[PDB]
Amino acid sequence: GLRHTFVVADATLPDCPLVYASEGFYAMTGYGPDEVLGHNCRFLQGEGTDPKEVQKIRDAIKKGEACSVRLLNYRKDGTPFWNLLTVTPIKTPDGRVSKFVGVQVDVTS
Ligand SMILES: *[C@@]12=NC3=[C]C([C])=C([C])[C]=C3N([C][C]([O])[C]([O])[C]([O])[C]OP([O])([O])=O)C1=NC(=O)[N]C2=O
């Protein structure tokens, strides 16, 4: 298949911190678990990140809906790369959102 990464966000906490990331996620971005875990994924964002696309993710999280955007992210070394992101809400049986799962694909080609 195509190369991709994977993270899990804990919705039971208010700002959706990351609680597990795939080895590809650390290797793609250059950040380590000690600088990724516990934090919201937005640290990957930067000057060229489109605020309208960011808005689409922020609303989907509030609304508990899946979303797919294309964002300009930045590695730890500041170099940019294009990240196609799909966020999926994971619900408990009672309809409540417990976790958000994100597949990140570098589509810089
Ligand atoms: C990020 N991946 C990512 C993965 C999950 C599971 C979730 C829930 C969010 C992301 N984001 C977005 C970020 O965490 C945040 O939700 C948005 O920026 C909108 O909220 P704010 O308050 O900051 O406007 C991801 N953002 C990225 O830029 N790159 C990803 O890989």
From Swiss-Prot:
Q: Which cysteines are joined by disulfide bonds?
A: none
Its biological purpose is as follows: Protein kinase that acts as a blue light photoreceptor. Required for non-photochemical quenching (NPQ), a mechanism that converts and dissipates the harmful excess absorbed light energy into heat and protect the photosynthetic apparatus from photo-oxidative damage. Controls the energy-dependent chlorophyll fluorescence quenching (qE) activity of chlorophyll excited states by inducing the expression of the qE effector protein LHCSR3 in high light intensities.
Domain named PAS is located at 1-64
Q: Which residues cross the membrane?
A: none
Q: Under which name does UniProt file this protein?
A: Phototropin
- Subcellular localization(s) per the UniProt record: Membrane
Q: How is it modified after translation?
A: Autophosphorylated in response to blue light irradiation.
The residues covered by the PAC domain are: 65-109
Origin organism of this chain?
Chlamydomonas reinhardtii
Q: What is the effect of changing C41A?
A: No effect on blue light-induced kinase activity
Q: Which residues are recorded as modified (S-4a-FMN cysteine)?
A: C41
Please state which protein family the record places this protein in. Belongs to the protein kinase superfamily. AGC Ser/Thr protein kinase family.
Identify the residues that bind FMN. N40, C41, R42, F43, L44, Q45, R58, N73, N83, Q104
**Tissue distribution of the protein:** Expressed in gametes, pre-gametes and gametes generated by pre-gametes (at protein level).
